[PDB]
């Protein structure tokens, strides 16, 4: 009976606490910063060969090997510097939705509507990629997956709960619960000590890999969260939802700092990515193109309209030399 | 300008040929999406047809292959995984007629049918509506008045009229009728004919696609 009143009181208390820190807006601080100007990129290489919609793609720790995932049931390993296919992993479930690339380059994860995360080992004595481990136990479609080490992987499912799986064992080590909607995105910090998850509740929850509890819950959106990307520094992150507006949260400020939205954009944000310096925010939209925003002084710096279908995923290399953009048109283009 | 990259290029071209072969092989297989308000209407046709989450049933009829994808176990948000079946050949929606007096069930079935019919991705996808549980419905219509489900049903409690009224109510959900085709049909546990019905419904869409590609429409 009194628990709901106490919850409302705590909500108002945290609201007032966050408001007390709202001294000045990011624009008031960045007024002294010069504009970035027009940013025009060139499609250096187009990676064609898929026979279905490309839904997910991830970059490796070498800036040359990138994994792709489409609805055709194939996982292609592309060599960025030569557009050559290195490996072609056949999938048992063509309904894939996410893909990951291990930091060392020896394992790649894949999941989707099968409620199973399949790990494939690339470094084997044979000449064929074999299944390492099949992690099962989720009651929802796998939305995103990212590796922490060679024996641990964080996976978000469409059951309001995330899970940390240990590969060599195959069981769950930490179940992160607290969401009220289907978890759609995951982004791990550079230190791999804490990761943020965006779900279908207009809220992004931060989680630690060891304890297993929610530290901060950032709100402000008005629709389902579809993309999230951690800031290179590791103390902030951007989140894009179907409301046609990206929002930057800071773990230290504990609230929003600035939003990215234009009156002409009315569609959702499917993917978001940051540059090496964090000054350029890449945003993939359903208008068959991607846009670049200034992280400090919100302004659209350029457009990467080079696809015929929705831009599924975006990826910026660790060195920030090029940007791989995938779309449902079966093409993955490398802009630079 | 290459020392050993020729071997890498050969491997790449070979796996490209392999992917092309797999694509042209999987391009001649019909894809069906099974939907329904309850397992009562879905599992009956799943087991009636020939030979975890999604369930893939692959069956061949008159040298034509069909892969039916059942996503009933996926209790997550449908809006986040329904877009994957945009390129589906047809949507087989099963509704149990013997469910109006087993509370509201038919209301949820109609809601789901309207949601999947007027969706952004299924603007032109064909829908085959299988009204199962014919015997149980004919048996219970005598006892339970149909007015419980349709308060505006001013008719007789016969089957040949209540079934027609239900079919009309289900077909009146498509706000756009000129672009979509609804294949309504009644079935039971011992029909064995639904295979030919689905085959005809798929051949119709195949003829439509051919007319599109041949330079017509």
């Amino acid at each position: 009976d009194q628990l709901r009143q106490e919850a409302e009181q705590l909500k108002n208390q945290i609201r007032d606490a966050r408001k007390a820190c709202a001294d000045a807006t990011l624009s008031q601080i960045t007024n002294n910063i010069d504009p970035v100007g027009r940013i025009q990129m060139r499609t250096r290489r187009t990676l064609r060969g898929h026979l279905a919609k490309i839904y997910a793609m991830h970059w490796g720790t070498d800036s040359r090997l990138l994994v792709s995932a489409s609805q055709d049931g194939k996982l292609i390993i592309w060599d960025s510097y030569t557009t050559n296919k290195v490996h072609a992993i056949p999938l048992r479930s063509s309904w894939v939705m996410t893909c990951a690339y291990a930091p060392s380059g020896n394992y790649v994860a894949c999941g989707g509507l099968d409620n199973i995360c399949s790990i494939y080992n690339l470094k084997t004595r044979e000449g064929n990629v074999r299944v390492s481990r099949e992690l099962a136990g989720h009651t929802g479609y796998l939305s995103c997956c990212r590796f922490l080490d060679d024996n641990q992987i964080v996976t978000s499912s469409g059951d309001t709960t995330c899970a940390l799986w240990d590969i060599e064992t195959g069981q769950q080590t930490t179940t992160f619960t607290g969401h009220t909607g289907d978890v759609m995105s995951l982004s791990l910090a550079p230190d791999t000590r804490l990761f943020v998850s965006g779900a279908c509740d207009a809220s992004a929850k931060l989680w630690d890999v060891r304890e297993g509890m929610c530290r901060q819950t950032f709100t402000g959106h008005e629709s389902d969260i579809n993309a999230i990307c951690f800031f290179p520094n590791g103390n902030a992150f951007a989140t894009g939802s179907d409301d046609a507006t990206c929002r930057l949260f800071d773990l230290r400020a504990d609230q929003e700092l600035m939003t990215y939205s234009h009156d002409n954009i009315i569609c959702g944000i499917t993917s978001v990515s940051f540059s090496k310096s964090g000054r350029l925010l890449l945003a993939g939209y359903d208008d068959f193109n991607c846009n670049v925003w200034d992280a400090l002084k919100a302004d659209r710096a350029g457009v990467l309209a080079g696809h015929d279908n929705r831009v599924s995923c975006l990826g910026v290399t660790d060195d920030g030399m090029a940007v791989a953009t995938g779309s449902w048109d079966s093409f993955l283009k490398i802009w630079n | 300008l290459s020392a050993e990259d020729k071997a890498a290029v050969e491997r790449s071209k070979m796996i490209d040929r392999n992917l092309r072969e797999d694509g042209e092989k999987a391009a001649r297989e019909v894809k069906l999406l099974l939907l329904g308000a309850g397992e009562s209407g879905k599992s009956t046709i799943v087991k009636q047809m020939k030979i975890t989450g999604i369930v893939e049933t692959h069956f061949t009829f008159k040298d034509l292959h069909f892969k039916m994808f059942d996503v009933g176990a996926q209790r997550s948000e449908r809006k986040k995984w329904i877009h994957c079946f945009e390129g589906v050949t047809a949507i087989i929606f099963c509704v149990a007629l013997s469910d109006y007096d087993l509370v509201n069930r038919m209301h949820e079935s109609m809601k789901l049918f309207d949601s999947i019919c007027n969706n952004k991705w299924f603007t032109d996808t064909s829908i085959i509506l299988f009204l199962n549980k014919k015997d149980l419905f004919e048996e219970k219509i005598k006892k339970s008045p149909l007015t419980i489900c349709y308060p505006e049903y001013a008719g007789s409690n016969t089957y040949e009229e209540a079934a027609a009224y239900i079919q009309c109510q289900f077909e009146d959900l498509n706000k756009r009728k000129d672009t979509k085709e609804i294949y309504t049909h009644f079935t039971c546990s011992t029909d064995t004919k639904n295979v030919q019905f689905v085959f005809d419904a798929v051949t119709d869409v195949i003829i439509k696609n051919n007319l599109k590609d041949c330079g017509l429409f």
Partner: single-chain antibody
Amino acid sequence: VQLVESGGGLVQPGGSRKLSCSASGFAFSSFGMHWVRQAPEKGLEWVAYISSGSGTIYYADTVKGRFTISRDDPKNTLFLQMTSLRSEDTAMYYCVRSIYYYGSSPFDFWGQGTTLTVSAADIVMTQATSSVPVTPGESVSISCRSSKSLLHSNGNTYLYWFLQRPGQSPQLLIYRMSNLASGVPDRFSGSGSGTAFTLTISRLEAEDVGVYYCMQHLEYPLTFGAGTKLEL
């Protein structure tokens, strides 16, 4: 993995002979195959090669025309037909496996080999060092001088160090001089610039006793080294 060679023995000069290399324990269809001969008390030498799926075949100009290499993926067997055998073809033929892609390690596994006795422009790999007795527990340095600059435009220099133990088949010690093969201890380092290369062994062990071969993989006319024998 396993590669068994058959068809060896005493062959008359000028006769025909078919050698069969049976493979097992891997995707034979997705691995290129090489033939590397080794005459009695002499260095290695490449003979012929087939790529994955028999898409590109290569032969050595020294024995071009007389050797016919073919593959059988259904049965996973590499056939080598030889006609007009001369008094120089007397040697032990090794059936080597390889694979080519970004980060690959070619020449990983070498077959046991088959002995055959017959009764009766290229990049020269100058291996000045022939034999050097070294005591255990000390560092060893094996030099390799090449004729042509193996440093390709892309950057990755193609040069392979192999080690052959007495009475055993050679194995891939180092590939590209900067990446160790799966199964080699962390005691062999490579350092190469232009045409000079050096293999450094920190701690010598009994298993390291053997002949070292420096084989360049810049042009398909592969030429092996002379050999560097060590002792325990």
